[model samples]
Target: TDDFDFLSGADEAATKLDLARAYIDMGDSEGARDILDEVLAEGNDSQQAEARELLERLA
Candidate 1:
């Protein structure tokens, strides 16, 4: 019943970043910004760097 919990740590961070990119593609900058903030808070070094760049572009 907990198979969905497989995505953790870096994997989850990467997934969130990808979702943020999709939001940006759909012209939903607010949605992408929100996800990027979450990534910045909990993601790894690379993920946080990417999130920061995306947030800058959103600005």
Candidate 2:
């Protein structure tokens, strides 16, 4: 019920992570890795943690 509501945030780290997941789902590990790198560089603690986890799994 609140799908769109979740997108109304100043922080976009989570959104980027979602996009990264989509890339992985599409069999684009390189694309996902690039996005995860960005997240690791700019995202906050929690976001970076998730990004690192996904990146490691890709390796």
* Local distance difference test, each candidate: 0.93, 0.87
Off by over 4 Å in 1: 1-5
* Model 1, residue 48: C-alpha shift (Å): 0.3
Q: Tell me, by lDDT, which candidate is best.
A: 1
**Cα lDDT tens digits for candidate 1, 1-59:** 98776767788889999999999999999999999999999899999999999999998
TM-score list, all predictions: 0.87, 0.79
Pairs that collide, model 2: none
Question: Native-vs-model 2 lDDT?
Answer: 0.87
Per residue, candidate 2 scores C-alpha lDDT tens digits across 1-59 of: 87756543317788899999999999999999999988888788899999999998899
Model 1 TM-score relative to the real fold: 0.87
